Write a protein that binds this ligand. Structure first.
Ligand SMILES: [Cl-]
Ligand SMILES: [Cl-]
Ligand SMILES: [Cl-]
Ligand SMILES: [Cl-]
Ligand code: NA
Lengths: 253, 257, 256, 252
């Protein structure tokens, strides 16, 4: 199942979409600068691109780390990003009451992994009718993603993206089960699956991120998700592999 | 470090405290019945007791599943429990806004394991000044507990309990690392460590719960956390606690080293 | 099911048996000194005791680190231990050819974890008719122990001990699943289950917490190593604590 | 570091080599037939190929299960394979005493995963001077492989291949850490690393799964792939495409 996000088609058989940006929104000027860089690189390579940032990050490393500019100013910034570059945007939400006003502006709303089972947030997100990115918790098996999908469906929204971020592997370390992508596709109706390489790696380097991104994209994925000419060299390699993989028909039976 | 909860002393070298009750509050009458049984049994065995229940099941499999009585009715039930039995109570909170009204009634407020990283909820809980039970996520190592403790300390609340519930082990399975208890004691300032045997078995029986509870308490813990239904069958509670008390008494009588 | 090892009764509802000794037999006099200390401490506390050592360490840190004294001299040392102290002994075997000559002298023979699926060794060990200790591989689940047991049974030997050594937990880390003891008892006919606390680790407070936790589940024995690994002089204090817990547990009927 | 195996160049920046064949040798005729198929498919795709089989099944579900043909008869069969097809072969050894006679015939000798820390078998294998394939145990981390490599080096053999077969993941399951390949390259002197996809899937062996997993591993730039209506060819076509692309990009 493909999802149209403005003029982008997101799907496990479509050219990969890059989701990237900055961790937390700080100011209009700084956001536009970082976004302009992603936009310039992705436009040069012909890669569809969706700008990501948090306006109110609830799982910060310290209680006083900056949460972001907050909802009202954050949405103003996202409007400006959309107006300037004509690209879609994605942001996370953590309170039910935020979902509607965020969804007025942000094309894709994201369900944090730690909130993935919180029924009230699932419902409030579903009811926006917007495209939703579901971050897969590290302790959930790929066959359990269907239960989250089922709750969104009950609440009336099927425009769901499944975002891999690795799996708990003993203490601290995460490992990405390359077989999990296929399991999610088979059990969740072939919804777009994207790969958050960055999270998957923070518990373990450019060479690593490249190996791990390439390995995942070799399984045929709708997109690559990054958390905060290097970007260019990286994306050239990902695009090479993605173009190859996507040009070949799915093996048939 | 010990924590006083009314007349209870909770600590890793004190007689174990039972945190027991039910999954979710369903009615006043059922709650009082179950509680009365836990109270009668614990009083005769001389085990300090704190009644546990959730007022809301926030993460059920279906949007349409029964969720429990809710905050306003739930707090009314907890008030009645406290008035009738004179014991402390514990419940979980899932939204920052709930922390203050819950804390007015409930002696211990609990941070759900799935929410342990939710910084706004930590801060809201800390600011109540109540005793807090931190459920250790299945995906977090015992040496990472200190980062959660640090957050509560930076927010001004040091009355913290660390609650083991097992660790992720492959897909859809949990294992309890009996060494993790000592790691949490050594890295988190010897705050009280308790063991949720019920949720540690989620992915696996009476015999199993006893073996696991005995093993954990053998490491010298402040408390045991469990659920029953009329989860262990409620009528087996007394026999189960006799065994746990026997072991706890023995362990706590031996000097540390 | 209990197993008689000379005058010792080994079983999940019997007083625990200590299996202890050293890593590798390196010399006679030092072996006897160490054994003497285990004997004195276990005799004082009334704990049945089986002396453990390897004569041929097949998995060494370096290719030329000393393997140990080898079969012929190792068995002579075991005979001397048996003659001097009148206790049983346990050692591991790595090759089918070693099973007979080791079984003639040693009261328990041990199947190394890394060799647990090697059918020729299983058969050769089974055919000795000796008591066998099966070391559970860190990658095998407790419900897969029955398959090793089955192979010993097919080969005609039911005098089997199952020995927990922990489970692989991510990289380089082991966890002991306290529920695995019960799974092994329920699936393998209540054969004696013993706990190798030493190999389950990789320090004193940790070994004690882990040993107590395990023994709380009701086990036939505890398996450990010391160095002249727990320090040998703290042995008494350690065993006092284990015995206290074992005595309490075993004095209570199984919850039925 | 590359390894020459007759006319094959095995290395992490060389075209991938397929190591493939069968579980256990059962008879001369069925071996030749299977080998002929691998040869025909690999030759037409232009993929270097090494034939794999065991002469003995050392871990049998039953004491009375069939064990395979054994050393003497097995080595006869391997000699016939080499003579008929002019390819190298690989087999595993389980006892020190077997290493020299096996090594006279078999181009690559393999250290079984369960025996990787058996020092006497390491030494005996090293002393053959043959190319050795070291199967990484499911319970050993990638950073520990350097200790095995060190032993073989001390014993005088540097012609080592490191073979990934997955890592223990809870009970009765495996997962393959795609970052482990890089760890092994970086810590073991860039020795050839190959991927045993077959054994990595033991606990899951669907065709779509094997392909996804093989493609993912080969995306990390490996020396080879190890495995046991025209499934092999369809699979190899896709693997070769990806390998050619990855190998054509310069290392960063
Ligand atoms: Cl997570
Ligand atoms: Cl709970
Ligand atoms: Cl959890
Ligand atoms: Cl092992
Ligand atoms: Na004997």
């Amino acid at each position: 199942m493909d999802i149209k996000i403005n003029d982008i088609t997101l799907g496990n058989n479509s050219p990969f979409v890059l989701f990237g940006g900055i961790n937390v929104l700080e100011s209009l000027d700084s956001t536009l600068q970082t976004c302009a860089h992603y936009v310039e690189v992705t436009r040069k390579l012909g890669i569809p691109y969706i700008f990501k940032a948090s306006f109110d990050k609830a799982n910060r490393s310290s209680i006083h780390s900056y949460r972001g500019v907050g909802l009202e100013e954050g949405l103003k910034i996202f409007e400006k990003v959309k107006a300037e570059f004509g690209i879609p945007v994605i942001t996370d939400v953590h309170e039910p009451h935020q979902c509607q006003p965020v969804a007025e502006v942000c094309d894709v709303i994201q369900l944090p992994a730690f909130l993935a089972q919180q029924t009230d947030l699932v419902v409030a997100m579903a009811k926006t009718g917007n495209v939703v990115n579901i971050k897969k918790p590290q302790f959930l098996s790929p066959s359990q993603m269907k239960n989250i999908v089922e709750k969104f469906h009950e609440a009336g929204n099927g425009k769901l993206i499944l975002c891999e971020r690795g799996s708990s592997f003993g203490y601290d370390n995460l490992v990405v089960d390359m077989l999990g992508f296929g399991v999610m596709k088979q059990t969740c109706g072939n919804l777009p699956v994207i790969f958050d390489v960055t999270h998957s790696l923070q518990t373990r380097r450019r060479a690593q991120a490249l190996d791990l991104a390439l390995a995942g994209m070799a399984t045929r994925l709708a997109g690559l998700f990054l958390e905060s000419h290097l970007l260019e060299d990286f994306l050239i390699r990902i695009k090479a592999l993605d173009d190859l993989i996507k040009s070949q028909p799915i093996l048939t039976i």
